[PDB]
Design an enzyme around this catalytic site. Structure first.
Site, PDB file in Angstrom:
ATOM      1  N   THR A  54       0.769  -1.259   0.000  1.00 47.46           N
ATOM      2  CA  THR A  54       0.000   0.000   0.000  1.00 47.46           C
ATOM      3  C   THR A  54       0.825   1.350   0.000  1.00 47.46           C
ATOM      4  O   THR A  54       0.392   2.363  -0.610  1.00 47.46           O
ATOM      5  CB  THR A  54      -0.931   0.028   1.080  1.00 47.46           C
ATOM      6  OG1 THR A  54      -0.328  -0.616   2.202  1.00 47.46           O
ATOM      7  CG2 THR A  54      -2.088  -0.792   0.689  1.00 47.46           C
ATOM      8  N   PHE A  59      -7.280   5.161   5.704  1.00 47.20           N
ATOM      9  CA  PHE A  59      -6.694   4.150   6.582  1.00 47.20           C
ATOM     10  C   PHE A  59      -7.829   3.470   7.356  1.00 47.20           C
ATOM     11  O   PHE A  59      -7.646   3.102   8.468  1.00 47.20           O
ATOM     12  CB  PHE A  59      -5.783   4.842   7.592  1.00 47.20           C
ATOM     13  CG  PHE A  59      -4.427   5.191   7.086  1.00 47.20           C
ATOM     14  CD1 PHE A  59      -3.517   4.245   6.780  1.00 47.20           C
ATOM     15  CD2 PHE A  59      -4.034   6.499   6.992  1.00 47.20           C
ATOM     16  CE1 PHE A  59      -2.187   4.603   6.289  1.00 47.20           C
ATOM     17  CE2 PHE A  59      -2.739   6.899   6.543  1.00 47.20           C
ATOM     18  CZ  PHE A  59      -1.818   5.951   6.157  1.00 47.20           C
ATOM     19  N   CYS A 110      -6.019   1.023  10.027  1.00 43.88           N
ATOM     20  CA  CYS A 110      -4.668   0.592   9.734  1.00 43.88           C
ATOM     21  C   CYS A 110      -3.828   0.712  11.003  1.00 43.88           C
ATOM     22  O   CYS A 110      -3.458   1.839  11.364  1.00 43.88           O
ATOM     23  CB  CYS A 110      -4.024   1.305   8.546  1.00 43.88           C
ATOM     24  SG  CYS A 110      -2.304   0.758   8.201  1.00 43.88           S
TER      25      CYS A 110
HETATM   26  C1  HEM Z   1      -0.364   3.900   2.923  1.00 44.31           C
HETATM   27  C2  HEM Z   1      -0.070   2.635   3.135  1.00 44.31           C
HETATM   28  C3  HEM Z   1      -1.273   1.989   3.840  1.00 44.31           C
HETATM   29  C4  HEM Z   1      -2.577   2.158   3.592  1.00 44.31           C
HETATM   30  C5  HEM Z   1      -3.392   3.025   2.605  1.00 44.31           C
HETATM   31  C6  HEM Z   1      -3.272   1.314   4.511  1.00 44.31           C
HETATM   32  C7  HEM Z   1      -4.639   1.209   4.560  1.00 44.31           C
HETATM   33  C8  HEM Z   1      -5.251   0.287   5.375  1.00 44.31           C
HETATM   34  C9  HEM Z   1      -6.713   0.099   5.318  1.00 44.31           C
HETATM   35  C10 HEM Z   1      -7.694   0.891   4.410  1.00 44.31           C
HETATM   36  C11 HEM Z   1      -6.987  -0.841   6.251  1.00 44.31           C
HETATM   37  C12 HEM Z   1      -8.351  -1.416   6.632  1.00 44.31           C
HETATM   38  C13 HEM Z   1      -8.827  -2.365   5.562  1.00 44.31           C
HETATM   39  C14 HEM Z   1     -10.235  -2.634   6.021  1.00 44.31           C
HETATM   40  O1  HEM Z   1     -10.572  -1.869   6.964  1.00 44.31           O
HETATM   41  O2  HEM Z   1     -11.001  -3.542   5.551  1.00 44.31           O
HETATM   42  C15 HEM Z   1      -5.731  -1.223   6.898  1.00 44.31           C
HETATM   43  C16 HEM Z   1      -5.728  -2.196   7.843  1.00 44.31           C
HETATM   44  C17 HEM Z   1      -4.595  -2.850   8.250  1.00 44.31           C
HETATM   45  N1  HEM Z   1      -3.346  -2.474   7.877  1.00 44.31           N
HETATM   46 FE1  HEM Z   1      -2.900  -0.826   6.576  1.00 44.31          FE
HETATM   47  N2  HEM Z   1      -2.363   0.642   5.315  1.00 44.31           N
HETATM   48  C18 HEM Z   1      -1.134   1.044   4.929  1.00 44.31           C
HETATM   49  C19 HEM Z   1       0.028   0.588   5.484  1.00 44.31           C
HETATM   50  C20 HEM Z   1       0.055  -0.413   6.366  1.00 44.31           C
HETATM   51  C21 HEM Z   1       1.220  -0.770   7.146  1.00 44.31           C
HETATM   52  C22 HEM Z   1       2.624  -0.359   6.812  1.00 44.31           C
HETATM   53  C23 HEM Z   1       0.914  -1.917   7.787  1.00 44.31           C
HETATM   54  C24 HEM Z   1       1.847  -2.708   8.697  1.00 44.31           C
HETATM   55  C25 HEM Z   1       3.214  -2.670   8.585  1.00 44.31           C
HETATM   56  C26 HEM Z   1      -0.498  -2.125   7.601  1.00 44.31           C
HETATM   57  C27 HEM Z   1      -1.154  -3.071   8.256  1.00 44.31           C
HETATM   58  C28 HEM Z   1      -2.468  -3.250   8.483  1.00 44.31           C
HETATM   59  C29 HEM Z   1      -3.092  -4.249   9.316  1.00 44.31           C
HETATM   60  C30 HEM Z   1      -2.582  -5.399  10.213  1.00 44.31           C
HETATM   61  C31 HEM Z   1      -4.522  -3.969   9.171  1.00 44.31           C
HETATM   62  C32 HEM Z   1      -5.628  -4.792   9.881  1.00 44.31           C
HETATM   63  C33 HEM Z   1      -5.824  -4.371  11.329  1.00 44.31           C
HETATM   64  C34 HEM Z   1      -7.274  -4.698  11.561  1.00 44.31           C
HETATM   65  O3  HEM Z   1      -8.214  -4.297  10.736  1.00 44.31           O
HETATM   66  O4  HEM Z   1      -7.415  -5.346  12.630  1.00 44.31           O
HETATM   67  N3  HEM Z   1      -1.014  -1.183   6.748  1.00 44.31           N
HETATM   68  N4  HEM Z   1      -4.665  -0.537   6.347  1.00 44.31           N
END
Ligand code: HEM
Ligand code: PAM
EC number: 1.14.14.1
Length: 455
Positions: free
Chosen positions: A268, A393, A400
């Site tokens: 991402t 996010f 996130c």
């Molecule tokens: C700009 C880069 C990133 C974007 C746009 C982003 C966006 C998101 C989004 C939209 C979700 C939720 C998806 C959903 O709610 O169905 C999310 C959840 C998550 N992201 Fe990211 N993220 C980014 C970077 C990262 C980073 C670097 C990590 C870890 C190193 C990460 C790890 C996670 C994890 C574990 C979740 C699930 C937590 C949960 O819903 O319990 N993301 N992220």
């Protein structure tokens, strides 16, 4: 009253599905938003979801009392290789909470700090890769962004060295990982999954799913045979105990969070870095403002956690890039219980809402008459932004986790980049967004003249 829900062309049994037959379904969706409004129903055989484009409805679904994260069909297909790592597990499901508690400690302000040194390690390899280039040669932007992001989570999160810059073809994990996302995304347009023409594809899936798991097997292997006292994601995965349950995490789950972290916490981000370097290049002033800021904060050969903390402006570039082209483009919610969404739409419990984030960011009644413009400034006063209006996010507890990690590496390297390098849009690249669940510009390349400044 109840308004009847808007909803595009149907094809007998195929319902709406023939609409999504394309490489760019999220783009196609934005288009159908645009045509249909702030909420439309999309129905395929078997499922039915409502896409939500408008801040008014969004904030209403963003309310945890009423709507839990739901696993969209996409997620469920990602779930075959991510099982129930944090990304792709229900909220009401033991491993979700456990792994939150167990795994959050690795994202706190102090951890950020130790991670920093190793970011730099990477961001240097990059800068250097670009410094060793000869005249003729260009940089293939999102390819090399991906080299960065992946080596970074590898080392930060797991202290494994993918060594992406030691290689000129993308990394086996990258390749089998891309073909997996592409699969998940095509499986969404399939009239009839069990058709024999999809047999070659199911085989290809298992093949790549394996490659990915292989690399986990190498990762866990080499953590065994090591002079450690690493304090990273892996030691916590492998040794923390959920203070709520006293329990630690099963092997089976660990091996899903490894895959999860190695995918979601690099793809991402590189997407962002590349949309970021995109709009910069297309906007040569904005580039310049941020390239100067930069010259004058990063006074040190090698940047420092606080040095990054002052790239005020470049964190603004990043927010905007993410505002225009949110690289994880939607999340999904179900109705916890029967409700009515903005006084107009009756939801039964079980109902699937679904947030088009790239459209949420283009709600003109929030952002101004000029949404399509790349204006970092609109991010001068975070304050002015209504809540639920910039959700790149995700929402609530289901949000996130890697966020502040992400901004921190982007802000970091963006900044160093802005400082060692003159960037020439040498081919007038017209924007091509590739979809593989997430989004990333395709075929975006550039030329980079150094300002010969060492590091
Ligand atoms: C700009 C880069 C990133 C974007 C746009 C982003 C966006 C998101 C989004 C939209 C979700 C939720 C998806 C959903 O709610 O169905 C999310 C959840 C998550 N992201 Fe990211 N993220 C980014 C970077 C990262 C980073 C670097 C990590 C870890 C190193 C990460 C790890 C996670 C994890 C574990 C979740 C699930 C937590 C949960 O819903 O319990 N993301 N992220
Ligand atoms: C755990 C692996 C990381 C998750 C990778 C997917 C990232 C965001 C998911 C995007 C869902 C977008 C749906 C697109 C088309 C549709 O909804 O029909």
């Amino acid at each position: 009253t109840i308004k009847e829900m808007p909803q595009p062309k149907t094809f007998g049994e195929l319902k709406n599905l023939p609409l999504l037959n394309t490489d760019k379904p999220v783009q196609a969706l934005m288009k159908i938003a645009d045509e249909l409004g702030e909420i439309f129903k999309f129905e395929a055989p078997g499922r039915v979801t409502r896409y939500l484009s408008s801040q008014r409805l969004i904030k209403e679904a963003c309310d945890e009392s009423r709507f839990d994260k739901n696993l969209s069909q996409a997620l469920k297909f990602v779930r075959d290789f991510a099982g129930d790592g944090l990304f792709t597990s229900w909220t009401h499901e033991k491993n979700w909470k456990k792994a939150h508690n167990i795994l959050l400690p690795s994202f706190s302000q102090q951890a950020m700090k130790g991670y920093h040194a190793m970011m730099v390690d990477i961001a240097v390899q990059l800068v250097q890769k670009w410094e060793r280039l000869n005249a003729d040669e260009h940089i293939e932007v999102p390819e090399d962004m991906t080299r960065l992001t992946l080596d970074t989570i590898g080392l930060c999160g797991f202290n494994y060295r993918f060594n992406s810059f030691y290689r000129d073809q993308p990394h086996p994990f990258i390749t089998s990982m891309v073909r997996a996302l592409d699969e998940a995304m095509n499986k969404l347009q399939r009239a009839n999954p069990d058709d024999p023409a999809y047999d070659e594809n199911k085989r290809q899936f298992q093949e790549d799913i394996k490659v990915m798991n292989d690399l986990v097997d190498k990762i866990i292997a080499d953590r065994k045979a090591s002079g450690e006292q690493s304090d990273d994601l892996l030691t916590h995965m492998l040794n923390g105990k959920d203070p709520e349950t006293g329990e630690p995490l099963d092997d089976e789950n660990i091996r899903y969070q490894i895959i999860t972290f190695l995918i979601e916490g690099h793809e991402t981000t590189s997407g962002l870095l590349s949309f970021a370097l995109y709009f910069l290049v297309k906007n040569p002033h904005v580039l310049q403002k941020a390239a100067e800021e930069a010259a004058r904060v990063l006074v040190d050969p090698v940047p420092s956690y606080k040095q990054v903390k002052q790239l005020k402006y470049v964190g603004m570039v990043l927010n905007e890039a993410l505002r225009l082209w949110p690289t994880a483009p939607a999340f999904s919610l179900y109705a916890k219980e029967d409700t009515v969404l903005g006084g107009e739409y009756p939801l039964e419990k079980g109902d699937e809402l679904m947030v088009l984030i790239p459209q949420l960011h283009r709600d003109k009644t929030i952002w101004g008459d000029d949404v399509e413009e790349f204006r970092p400034e609109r991010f001068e006063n975070p304050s002015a932004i209504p809540q639920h209006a910039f959700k790149p996010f995700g929402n609530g507890q289901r949000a996130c986790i890697g966020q502040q990690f992400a901004l921190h590496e982007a802000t970091l390297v963006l900044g160093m980049m802005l400082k060692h390098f003159d960037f020439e849009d040498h081919t007038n690249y017209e924007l091509d967004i590739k979809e593989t669940l997430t989004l990333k510009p395709e075929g975006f390349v550039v030329k980079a003249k150094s300002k010969k400044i060492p590091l």
